[PDB]
Write an enzyme that holds these catalytic residues in place. Structure first.
Site, PDB file in Angstrom:
ATOM      1  N   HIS A  40      -5.318   0.589  -6.651  1.00 37.93           N
ATOM      2  CA  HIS A  40      -4.447   1.614  -6.092  1.00 37.93           C
ATOM      3  C   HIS A  40      -2.959   1.282  -6.235  1.00 37.93           C
ATOM      4  O   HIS A  40      -2.146   2.182  -6.074  1.00 37.93           O
ATOM      5  CB  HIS A  40      -4.875   2.001  -4.676  1.00 37.93           C
ATOM      6  CG  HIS A  40      -4.319   1.181  -3.603  1.00 37.93           C
ATOM      7  ND1 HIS A  40      -5.051   0.270  -2.891  1.00 37.93           N
ATOM      8  CD2 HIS A  40      -3.110   1.244  -3.045  1.00 37.93           C
ATOM      9  CE1 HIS A  40      -4.271  -0.218  -1.931  1.00 37.93           C
ATOM     10  NE2 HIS A  40      -3.099   0.387  -1.988  1.00 37.93           N
ATOM     11  N   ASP A  84     -11.563  -1.394  -5.684  1.00 40.02           N
ATOM     12  CA  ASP A  84     -10.107  -1.393  -5.631  1.00 40.02           C
ATOM     13  C   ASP A  84      -9.577  -2.751  -6.094  1.00 40.02           C
ATOM     14  O   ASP A  84      -9.159  -3.616  -5.307  1.00 40.02           O
ATOM     15  CB  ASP A  84      -9.598  -1.030  -4.255  1.00 40.02           C
ATOM     16  CG  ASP A  84      -8.114  -0.748  -4.226  1.00 40.02           C
ATOM     17  OD1 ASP A  84      -7.539  -0.633  -5.325  1.00 40.02           O
ATOM     18  OD2 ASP A  84      -7.536  -0.668  -3.103  1.00 40.02           O
ATOM     19  N   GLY A 175       2.516  -1.966   1.745  1.00 40.93           N
ATOM     20  CA  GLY A 175       3.372  -2.866   1.011  1.00 40.93           C
ATOM     21  C   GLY A 175       2.742  -4.254   0.871  1.00 40.93           C
ATOM     22  O   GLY A 175       3.132  -5.008   0.011  1.00 40.93           O
ATOM     23  N   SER A 177      -0.470  -4.212   0.119  1.00 44.70           N
ATOM     24  CA  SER A 177      -1.573  -3.844  -0.776  1.00 44.70           C
ATOM     25  C   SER A 177      -1.561  -4.672  -2.050  1.00 44.70           C
ATOM     26  O   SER A 177      -0.516  -4.869  -2.629  1.00 44.70           O
ATOM     27  CB  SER A 177      -1.499  -2.392  -1.128  1.00 44.70           C
ATOM     28  OG  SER A 177      -1.661  -1.624   0.047  1.00 44.70           O
ATOM     29  N   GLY A 178      -2.748  -5.068  -2.519  1.00 43.75           N
ATOM     30  CA  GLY A 178      -2.902  -5.828  -3.752  1.00 43.75           C
ATOM     31  C   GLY A 178      -2.828  -7.343  -3.544  1.00 43.75           C
ATOM     32  O   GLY A 178      -3.158  -8.127  -4.433  1.00 43.75           O
TER      33      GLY A 178
END
Ligand SMILES: [Ca+2]
Length: 223
Positions: A40, A84, A175, A177-178
């Site tokens: 994402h 994801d 923020g 994320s990942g």
């Protein structure tokens, strides 16, 4: 990160910032030429920023390297966030030292109960907005599959796990994320999703990295 602490400069040497003119997502360095992040987070024009602490000041341990190729998981579904996960190849190899270092992939999954370190430059407020300049950290346990599924009925797949605190107040956020979830020195999760941040009975939901190690290794071997 809501309800965390300041990690300390370069104490999380595998943490990367994805930059497209500004920080927009985290990632993890898994060898000198590859980064793992959330699907994402995909966009074009990614610069990977290694060795960061303050993302708004050049402090002297940075390496800035353009992505040469991005690979979203073949089965990524943006509606459910199932699978994801994405791989980013760097145009050049990063120089590895104490402050920039790869994180080991898991040989086995983590279980409920295991404490983990979650890190990122995401929002620090649950009912508010404040983005830090320096890397933030949270120690949090993996939750049981049953309490995960009870928190989010009909939404948790076999490629997801929950971590954090059901009482609220401590979580990852926008923020982050990942970015990484590291448990006993192994990359076990990727910051993926959740209802708001740090809300009661709405823990963080993470990509279950151990399910993807075969895909990661073959992809690296052929690209
Ligand atoms: Ca910096």
């Amino acid at each position: 990160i809501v309800g965390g602490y300041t990690c300390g400069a370069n104490t999380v040497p595998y943490q990367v910032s994805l930059n497209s003119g500004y920080h927009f997502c985290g990632g993890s360095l898994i060898n000198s030429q590859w980064v793992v992040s959330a699907a994402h987070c995909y966009k074009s024009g990614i610069q990977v920023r290694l060795g960061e602490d303050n993302i708004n000041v050049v402090e002297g341990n940075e390496q800035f390297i353009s992505a040469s190729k991005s690979i979203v998981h073949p089965s990524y579904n943006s509606n459910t966030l199932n699978n994801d996960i994405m791989l980013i190849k760097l145009k050049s190899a990063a120089s590895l030292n104490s402050r920039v270092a790869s994180i080991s992939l898991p040989t086995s999954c983590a279980s409920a109960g295991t404490q983990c370190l979650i890190s990122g430059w995401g929002n620090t407020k649950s009912s508010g907005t404040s983005y830090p300049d320096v890397l933030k950290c949270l120690k949090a346990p993996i939750l049981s599959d049953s309490s995960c599924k009870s928190a989010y009925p009909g939404q948790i797949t076999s490629n997801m796990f929950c971590a954090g605190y059901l009482e609220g107040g401590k979580d990852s956020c926008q923020g982050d994320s990942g970015g990484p979830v590291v448990c006993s020195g192994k990359l076990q999760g990727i910051v993926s999703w959740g209802s708001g941040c740090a809300q009661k009975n709405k823990p963080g939901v993470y990509t279950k990295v151990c399910n993807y190690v075969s895909w990661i290794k073959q992809t690296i071997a052929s690209n």
